[PDB]
């Protein structure tokens, strides 16, 4: 049955300027020794309307994994504003954390990310072209959506 | 007797670009409930020749500490290249993890850190001014030096 269990994900440095890298402290535990890799990924939904604007901010390999509890900080650079459609830049979007074992994603932790202006002038009269240097990323950390998948564990 | 014992230190994200933050998964035991705080520090020896170039990359307060086994990931930003003398930038240096109780350092875990270029061109013909954006930090994790100190625990 499931060899890996994700115990906790802590959103660090939040809220932060849009350009700050994402930081998540992950705690997971291993039932048995894995002389095999686990592949962690951070995926930003740049545009909600299309899948082509999803950005894999980083992909990390963790292995071999000895049985027991492990902890690490998954950090990934901010998404490229050059690939974010203007209409989807200001407002609520999604950031994902997904772990893969043997080519199968077994867990996906999603967070709503609200990117808003901090200055009163922009909050009342936002520019037609989004100013990413004036946006604040507030990941809604108190409400993650955890989804587990029935995979093939060996 | 000693109230705290460091069980394990795991060097995470290694080797890495010079600019990546340091990550250490630390496990420690607490014999009894602690009245004070334990102050953890990550110190980088910027210059082997002079102590004035040692950089405290981060200092964390962990407390109050209940009796039992605890685990956390101590993360600290990379050293400021602006404070690293050119002569001491490329090659072997030292990073330390120290813990203090009531203003007294009781443990010090040291690692040799080898900062080297990855490109053949730079490895054969290194620049007079070190290029920190092209240096790879490799903490020699398989051989830490653990030093315990006699401190007043009560």
């Amino acid at each position: 049955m499931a060899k890996v269990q994700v115990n906790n994900v802590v959103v660090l440095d939040n809220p932060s300027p849009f350009y700050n890298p994402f930081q998540f402290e992950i705690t997971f535990e291993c039932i048995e020794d894995l002389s095999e890799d686990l592949e962690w990924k951070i995926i930003y939904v740049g545009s909600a309307e299309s899948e082509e604007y999803d950005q894999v901010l980083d992909s990390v390999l963790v292995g071999p994994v000895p049985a027991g509890r492990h902890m690490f900080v998954f950090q990934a650079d901010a998404p490229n504003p050059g690939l974010i459609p203007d209409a989807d830049a200001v407002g609520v979007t999604v950031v994902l954390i997904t772990c893969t074992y043997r080519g199968q994603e077994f867990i996906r932790v999603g967070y709503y990310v609200n990117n808003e202006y901090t200055e009163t002038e922009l909050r009342e009269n936002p520019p037609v072209k989004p100013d990413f240097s004036k946006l604040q990323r507030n990941i809604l950390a108190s409400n993650p959506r955890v989804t587990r998948f029935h995979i093939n564990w060996e | 007797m000693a109230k705290v014992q460091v069980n394990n230190v795991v060097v995470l994200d290694n080797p890495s670009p010079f600019y990546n933050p340091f990550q250490f998964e630390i496990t420690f035991e607490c014999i009894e409930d602690l009245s004070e705080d334990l102050e953890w520090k990550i110190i980088y020896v910027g210059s082997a020749e002079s102590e004035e170039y040692d950089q405290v990359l981060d200092s964390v307060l962990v407390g109050p500490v209940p009796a039992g086994r605890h685990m956390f990931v101590f993360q600290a930003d990379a050293p400021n290249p602006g404070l690293i003398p050119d002569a001491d930038a490329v090659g072997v240096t030292v990073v330390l993890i120290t813990c203090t109780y009531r203003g007294q350092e009781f443990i010090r875990v040291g690692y040799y850190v080898n900062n080297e270029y990855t490109e053949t061109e730079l490895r054969e013909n290194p620049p007079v001014k070190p290029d920190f954006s092209k240096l790879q930090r490799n903490i020699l994790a398989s051989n830490p030096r653990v030093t315990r100190f006699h401190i007043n625990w009560e």
Partner: peptide
């Protein structure tokens, strides 16, 4: 992929 980066290795932690």
């Amino acid at each position: 992929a980066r290795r932690i």
